[PDB]
Amino acid sequence: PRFLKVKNWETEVVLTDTLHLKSTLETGCTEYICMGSIMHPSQHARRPEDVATKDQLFPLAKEFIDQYYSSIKRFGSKAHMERLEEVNKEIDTTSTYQLKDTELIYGAKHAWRNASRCVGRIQWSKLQVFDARDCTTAHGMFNYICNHVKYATNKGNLRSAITIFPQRTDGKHDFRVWNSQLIRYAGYKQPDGSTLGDPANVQFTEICIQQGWKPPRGRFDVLPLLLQANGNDPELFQIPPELVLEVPIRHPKFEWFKDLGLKWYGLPAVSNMLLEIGGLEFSACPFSGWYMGTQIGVRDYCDNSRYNILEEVAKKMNLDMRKTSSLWKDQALVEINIAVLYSFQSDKVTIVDHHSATESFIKHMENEYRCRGGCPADWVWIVPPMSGSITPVFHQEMLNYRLTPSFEYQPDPWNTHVWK
Amino acid sequence: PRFLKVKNWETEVVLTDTLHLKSTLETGCTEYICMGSIMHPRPEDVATKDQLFPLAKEFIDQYYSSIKRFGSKAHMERLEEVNKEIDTTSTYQLKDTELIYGAKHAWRNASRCVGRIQWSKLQVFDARDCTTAHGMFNYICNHVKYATNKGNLRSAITIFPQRTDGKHDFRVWNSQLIRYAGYKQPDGSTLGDPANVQFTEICIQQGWKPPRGRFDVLPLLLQANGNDPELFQIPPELVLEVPIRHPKFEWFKDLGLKWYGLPAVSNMLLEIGGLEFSACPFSGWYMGTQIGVRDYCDNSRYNILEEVAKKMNLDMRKTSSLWKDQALVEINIAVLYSFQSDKVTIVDHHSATESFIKHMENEYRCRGGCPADWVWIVPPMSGSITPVFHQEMLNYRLTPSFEYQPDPWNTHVWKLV
Ligand code: HEM
Ligand code: HEM
Ligand SMILES: C[C@H](O)[C@H](O)[C@H]1CNc2nc(N)[nH]c(=O)c2N1
Ligand SMILES: C[C@H](O)[C@H](O)[C@H]1CNc2nc(N)[nH]c(=O)c2N1
Ligand SMILES: [Zn+2]
């Protein structure tokens, strides 16, 4: 370091990174090993296991409050020094402190801005922040989440949003959305060993069923919300169906494609991540933007028990499926992604293709390097899962590093929860 | 750090890496920045005696360990013999067995190579007695003929004399042994392979008379003993080529495209025991997606990707039609179909990545790990429908290794006036 250059090998544009000097947490890499493809490479946290002591929390608070007041050209201002004194006394009397609305908004936007894995970040400063820190019950969380879904969906003109529930206190009163996303389809393990619905959600579906949910065992079964407030046992809630925008998937040239009876939901809303601002941990911070078409996992969706939507498309396309070298998987994959984009666009539901999104991300990187001196970026996650080398991010070198505020992963609550 | 675990999020298979404890050279990353997607993180800069000794001992220790003779009298005398050579001559010479072992493990250690399940079957051609570019040409012709094997390709490496003082390097100035020329036209269009315009200009500048055709095999530009490079024309009957056609699009053959059967990387440096083999052309066989025919500019400023989409009557107005994606798949279908039809070895990215996963698991079992560069192992298309996408990998640099080295035209001290 001192500065680190990244090069685009198509355009030969070189960007020079100084922002990485502000990085706090370990990537997991060393001089001798690179962990760039490990999902969860580092356990390096800014605060310890449980209720931090003052000398563990206040340095983190000061750093964030310093960062925030710097960001508004108010460093050392009257309001800044007062805020530090305020945070100091709050920690002294409660072992935590409470963000101001401006600080919460600033922190959530920057956690997104710092999300190295997110290709959508050109939009980062246009995040609608819903303060839900007054919420006390799962019912209130359900209400907050319904309003989020309604606002974000916006009749298909999707709007970036995050709803932030009360921060962690002692780790035994966590707010959690047990759902990984607010809207997902059930996965049903079948007695003949196979899977019905979305196979990614089989375990959570079973948890819901175990928690009393009566599964329709139908086709595209929207999973209930499993909401945990104040560390209590989670509670089941059915999202009002009129709040769940769905796009029937059809194909602009394959008339048979709609006969697959496929649909997907318009709003992707990640709800299992942890938002970390100045040592404060918001274990329930569901956020939503809009889909990049490649994200829509309708390809893995199982409508029967012995075949998959990829294979089913390839069959209806009369592709030879004996040998891989026919690229029938690649052919069908493209066609499914054409259908998804075509269907969302026809229904006027916000969606971005991976060409437009990666092109915007390159534009975002240029902006960030110009104004901020860097942009943390995880090539492994930024490059789209299809047609990687014909998108502009492929030949774009990227530096990955951990800035705070940040979105963090956290354990699945059912592994960690003590029932009552 | 005893153990490191990599998980496959598709299969849930967890592998434990101990082999990373043996790594010695940098990855480029630091504890706070990952440089995993950075491409690469003086001639006098040859190993001093004191630098060379421990690199040599590290290699010899590793070799005698591999043949279950570590600490043996043979091991000890080889060590002593190597140190005497470094003491007197400031360098030392690999035994033939050590050279073979070393080239094979440089491939085995190539974290960016998806084809490593084959590593132990490499044919090693010892060309360390070579002294001139003519001799290099002869050695390279024999490599091409042996590796091509009338389309039943065989992996091979040809190793020219190691670096001495940095002023006597052997170099293949070609990036691959067989490439097509690229010619920039006055009107900004490109004829042939736009990837090779720069090297083509060097060749013409060295006196090569270019055919200025569409698929002109470039001349070999060969440098021996630090002398100026010399041009040689590969005998055309040694260059196996595949006309590219499509199993369904009859018009694809009318694009008049072909590609060469033998990918043979010639610009890397082979490092064994601190010794540097600056000329070590090696070859296996293509993965279909490597073949750069799509970037090829037959006739004009437009390339085969665009031309194929045009013939496919694709809506090229908007990106969200995914016409680029569709034409990309069709080009890769045509490439695999053509090679297979002509019985020229090729692997598709599905087969290649599935084999890599098997290879990686076997390496974890028998070797304690497999350094792998996800950024380069995942194919350049359809990444997530291949098994490596969900495969966590640990990247680390083991020696012997293949390394990048500067382009020779940037560093060569020209002799001829
Ligand atoms: C506005 C449109 C957005 C688009 C197109 C987008 C796109 C993406 C994509 C493609 C990924 C890779 C993960 C995957 O493949 O599923 C990702 C990851 C991520 N996004 Fe965005 N995103 C958007 C909005 C947002 C917002 C509003 C936030 C938070 C305020 C956010 C935070 C994140 C985070 C933290 C990750 C990493 C998640 C993980 O590690 O699993 N994104 N995004
Ligand atoms: C036998 C079939 C082989 C296949 C299918 C194969 C495939 C590949 C692929 C797909 C890459 C990624 C870089 C790229 O996109 O070109 C790669 C990289 C590499 N391969 Fe292999 N390879 C094979 C044989 C070999 C052999 C015989 C050697 C050396 C003895 C070798 C050494 C390397 C090295 C050093 C790299 C890294 C190149 C770089 O960093 O730019 N490979 N290989
Ligand atoms: C093992 C691998 O690193 C991991 O599965 C990552 C790879 N890159 C990814 N990239 C995106 N966008 N989404 C993903 O889930 C993943 N998975
Ligand atoms: C910027 C990026 O890291 C670089 O261009 C790499 C990415 N991965 C790659 N992977 C393969 N197989 N081949 C390549 O040329 C590249 N390019
Ligand atoms: Zn790294």
Author numbering:
A (entry chain B): 303 to 722
B (entry chain A): 303 to 343, 349 to 724
Copy the relevant paper text.
Here, we used a combination of crystallography, mutagenesis, and computational methods to better understand the structural basis for these differences in NOS inhibitor binding.
We asked the questions, how can the inhibitor displace BH4, and does the inhibitor displacing BH4 in hnNOS bind synergistically or independently from the inhibitor bound in the active site? To explore these questions, we “knocked out” the active site inhibitor binding by mutating the active site Glu to Gln in both hnNOS and heNOS to generate hnNOS E597Q and heNOS E361Q. 4 binds in neither the active site nor the BH4 site in these hnNOS and heNOS mutants. Most unexpected, however, was that the same backbone changes in the region of hnNOS residues 598–611 were observed when two molecules bind to wild-type hnNOS occurred in the compound 4-soaked hnNOS E597Q structure, even though no inhibitor was bound in the active site and BH4 remained bound in its site. In addition, mutating the active site Glu to Gln in nNOS resulted in the same conformational change that results from two inhibitors binding. This suggests that when two inhibitors bind, the first one enters the active site and hydrogen bonds with the active site Glu, lowering the energetic barrier to the conformational change required to bind the second molecule that displaces BH4.
